[PDB]
Design a protein around this ligand. Sequence first.
Ligand SMILES: [Zn+2]
Ligand SMILES: [Zn+2]
Ligand SMILES: [Zn+2]
Ligand SMILES: [Zn+2]
Ligand SMILES: [Zn+2]
Ligand SMILES: [Zn+2]
Ligand SMILES: [Zn+2]
Ligand SMILES: [Zn+2]
Lengths: 146, 146
Amino acid sequence: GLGPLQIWQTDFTLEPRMAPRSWLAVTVDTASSAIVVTQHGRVTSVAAQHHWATAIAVLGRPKAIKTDNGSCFTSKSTREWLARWGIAHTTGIPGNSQGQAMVERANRLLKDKIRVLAEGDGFMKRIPTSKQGELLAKAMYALNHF
Amino acid sequence: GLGPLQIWQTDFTLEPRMAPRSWLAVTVDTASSAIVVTQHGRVTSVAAQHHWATAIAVLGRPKAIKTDNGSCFTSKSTREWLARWGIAHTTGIPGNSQGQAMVERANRLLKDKIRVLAEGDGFMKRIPTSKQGELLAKAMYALNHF
Ligand SMILES: [Zn+2]
Ligand SMILES: [Zn+2]
Ligand SMILES: [Zn+2]
Ligand SMILES: [Zn+2]
Ligand SMILES: [Zn+2]
Ligand SMILES: [Zn+2]
Ligand SMILES: [Zn+2]
Ligand SMILES: [Zn+2]
């Protein structure tokens, strides 16, 4: 049982094609490379908690999650939510540089796939609100192919 | 590679504690017993398609899905959505009796866990709208423990 560590990297990335809920919260399980994404109207502490509750239902509970120092991830509210779950959190090392690189790469592959799938459906600018969820789901499936 | 068949059972169950989006769409992968649930305001053909797009992002694409003859699953719109995905569908045998039993059992374990987790949080009647998603996510995690 000397298998990979159950550690996640999480980040928010802006995607105007998904407006009005244009902030995409993306989590990469570093142990399997699975990706989970959710959309939100604003980046708050509560959006990050909503995102991780879903990721937890999808990937199970991690031992730890690594984020940057964005304030939605470092407020007291977030620290308490993570403590209630027993999940450890680290924002890395002060002036990390790298070490968030996997989720930054997932952010980019994700936006590219949304753009090619959207354009494939004839949406060259914003994706109609009513079509967003299924297209976000399709991009997520295309990047995991469970 | 003589491992289980990638066949899903899907159904809708009403849960007043989740009002106004009180119809829960539940899918059980019969190959692993994993469960995926989503909430909806009305049972339409489009609610079933929204539910399966999410399940597909979570469990990958199945070879087939088995449902009852509820009309949201048998309209032309649904038949076409499933055909676009290459997924086969069966509503079983005319007067099946059983053969949907796993998802009917998942419907019941699911509503029980929502009730115990809700009550654990002090919500004895409807769960506040703003608390529903995280509690639905928690019930889904509690029944899968990924
Ligand atoms: Zn960030
Ligand atoms: Zn939210
Ligand atoms: Zn970033
Ligand atoms: Zn695939
Ligand atoms: Zn039914
Ligand atoms: Zn919907
Ligand atoms: Zn039923
Ligand atoms: Zn667990």
